[PDB]
Symmetry: C3
Subunit: 356 residues, 3 copies
């Protein structure tokens, strides 16, 4: 990719992409998981991503993590989540392909895979160092508390408490698989969480559509419950791009659902990168960096991106230039008045490859 | 204390308690003081604690600290505070045994012991590195400003300025002791602070109480002036405990008013601790860590705990398990359907001895 | 300057002043510039300052910086700014001598000097590590993106792109200089920013006036656009001082507009400093530190000062001593009742010279 400056792409810059599709899965009993955060992807400071899969009847046990909020995109299949708030309120809900969930910092939750196939989902966390091996597990908790005290807390005999796990369980296919949603009632009288904490992203109408190119956006404006995180789906036709832009107020974490994605990134100071991502690869654009993404393949492209802010903010190059008077633009770009008037006058979000 | 996993208590973790009652006092003319923060209790990042006493007519001098808010519980005796806000408003007030005060970051204040006893109190600060040696003292200030400038600001002669203290006074019993409260009038016309910055804690009705065990809570709901911080009193009968829980949004700092406390802290990744606290000893429980406290002794237990958030938030293991369906629970704990049904169905905050 | 404690001024403290007047200017085509941040003035953590000048028709090119907000005071002459918000809204306005602007983090902007002489202004940033060499330049941007993508984004030929600059332009005088304000119209339909992002500071009625001494203040109350930054103008007569005070909620950055300033700073634990600043020199007071400033010269003094909070808070030694009862003051200062009653009973903010 030639550039007007001949910058050596990548030089003096952290990687902005990670070959996540090549990270080995860690295997569990009815589940798989891998993760990418600052520990292996140094640039990714504000967010970490976790791939996880659950089979039918496999649960990611009751756990919490106060150091991070959990935003989720279900890529395939069907899950059921439970979520319990600091106010004793609960949500028990199904989330399917294209659905989101948001677990506020430190709230207890679980995720179970419901049949017939395997649920596969992404979990993005608003803390770059987050690791699925440093969550707080209830099985770990109760097995690391004096037995007498657990007996007292539960009102149980030693023989009863003795049947609890002896260490963190993490993922379980011990059973039973959960029944129909309507029957999944709390064992004790419990007030329902009323602000929705799941949401349907994929089935939204596009916010923007231009010759096949599509953007669906879920910010606090459409998913108020995810109050400080936003996510979007972009669909890119062959040859098309998301125009050049930057986000004033957020980092952008990316994952390629299918296709091949070219991403370019401008730090300041004459430094910049460009590079390709395969299906299942990950990208990260730090707050304020200029960037753009192009589909250079023969096939369509789908990615999900996530921002660590509930208020989606974008300034496109075109919008920016369009807002300035000729004189300013001509002076900045040092170009003839004839060329000046040919700068962008409106902002179409995507840009098309040239027409037949 | 046996566990299911036979975990070695304390292995791979910092101390969650500090033998404060063994920390020596520093002595002043009319008061005494000691402190615990990250400098001697490394885990205590979110809060630091100071113990202080004031003889009658001794005063903690006018000072300020922009780097920390000051939240207080009066353990014994009676005090009088003054407090001056950025809008030139003042509160002059009494705080007795069981009373709170909150001094917003950088607002000026003073504390005096009124009669007829020794006032003893705890100051808790939302900054673990806070040090009583690092306050901005007005006596220190004027003695460290150029004489000429002090003359000008006060409109005083060299001989008048000459009589000010030569270095930080800190605590003084020079006098006079203070008059009745209705006579403690500002020397100049000064508007009064209207949102209360003191509060009565010990005197509240128990928020929750079961079989003699009681919890008194002062969050921003009951003490809005303390917008930033929350305080609580727990009284625990022999053999009883606060249930297993964690706090999603805050660190917990603890002091033992009287009795003996057993504290357990579980830190994740198979690590956990359990230990005893004598009276006057201090505990700290990092945000989000699971914990519980228990009275394992023949006498009663009384402690004050403080959170660095004004919105008290708790998830009790019981509420949590109660909120979940049979299947999820059974599958998680890998126990039988019959045992599953015997998991908590309600949360009584405390658990009684069986 | 003698003191009651005989403190060795400066000892165990960082410099609270910086000889900015003697920092070499970096020369551009019709513009000059120099800067002070933590890189050369270690104490200045919360705010960095930039001096800049533009000739008629010299523009500081279209750029942005998400890492910091921009508060400006115009010292001499006249400028025009443009500011584009995350919602494709624009303000295009003139800012003349004594006027402010505020550019929110990561909003895109530009500054042109308009006639007739040299525009001279201060830029204060709410990040003490900000450096004018690390902004995001639109020209740098476009010369560091794949050419084919610049083509597609702009709907332009390779021939047309070859005309754009080849590296960061920074300051341009290529022209044309901008025309009358009413003709400075955006090149494409752009809604206007409705909340004013400029403000007349020097033109304000003084907030406080005592025997020639005057403070003019622009917090969020008079300039709500500058939501988290405050600026003030202090005029100080020969012999006069700003009373001893501290700010509970903000650091203070100071620049000497003309005259000769004296700053004392008190830093806790028997440590304090005092020193002189010449015109063009810079002062910094960390939050909470006790301070006062005095004019010890035979002529007048003018400073601008900036705060990294939109809510102005000051507690004066006088307001404070005034609000306590005699017993408290007497006991604290260890002095006779007689003397106690002669402490301040009101607050005039300045103090007139008391030397006979
Ligand atoms: Mn989780
Ligand atoms: Mn983007
Ligand atoms: Mn204090
Ligand atoms: Mn607790
Ligand atoms: Mn700028
Ligand atoms: Mn000041």
């Amino acid at each position: 990719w030639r550039s007007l400056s001949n910058v050596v792409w990548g030089k003096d810059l952290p990687a902005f992409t990670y070959a996540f599709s090549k990270t080995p899965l860690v295997l569990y009993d009815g589940g798989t998981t891998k993760q990418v955060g600052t520990y292996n992807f140094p640039v990714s400071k504000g967010m970490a991503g976790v791939y996880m899969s659950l089979e039918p009847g496999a649960i990611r046990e009751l756990h919490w993590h106060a150091n991070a909020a959990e935003w989720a995109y279900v890529m395939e299949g069907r899950t059921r989540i439970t979520l319990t708030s600091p106010e004793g309120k609960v949500e028990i809900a199904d989330v399917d392909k294209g659905g989101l969930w948001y677990f506020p910092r430190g709230w207890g939750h679980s995720i179970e895979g419901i049949g017939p196939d395997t649920a596969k989902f992404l979990l993005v966390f608003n803390d770059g160092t987050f690791s699925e091996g440093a969550t707080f597990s209830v099985t770990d908790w109760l097995s690391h508390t004096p037995i007498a005290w657990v007996e007292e807390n539960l009102g149980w005999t030693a023989a009863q408490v003795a049947q609890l796990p002896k260490k963190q369980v993490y993922i379980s296919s011990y059973g039973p698989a959960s029944g129909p949603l309507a029957s999944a009632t709390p064992q004790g009288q419990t007030a329902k969480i009323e602000v929705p904490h799941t949401h349907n992203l994929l089935g939204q109408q596009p916010l923007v559509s231009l010759g096949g190119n599509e953007l669906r956006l879920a910010s606090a404006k459409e998913f108020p419950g995810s109050f400080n995180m936003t996510g979007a789906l972009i669909h890119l036709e062959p040859g098309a791009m998301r125009q050049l832009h930057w986000h004033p107020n957020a980092d952008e974490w990316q994952y390629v659902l299918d296709g091949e994605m070219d991403l370019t990134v401008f730090a300041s100071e004459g430094k910049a990168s460009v590079s390709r991502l395969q299906q299942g690869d990950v990208g990260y654009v730090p707050k304020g960096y200029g960037h753009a993404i192009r589909n250079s393949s023969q096939k369509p492209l789908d990615i999900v991106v996530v921002f660590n802010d509930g208020d989606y903010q974008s300034i496109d190059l075109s919008t920016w230039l369009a807002s300035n008077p000729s004189s300013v633009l001509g002076n900045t770009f040092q170009i003839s008045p004839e060329l000046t008037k040919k700068l962008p006058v409106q902002d179409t979000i995507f840009s098309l490859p040239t027409q037949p």
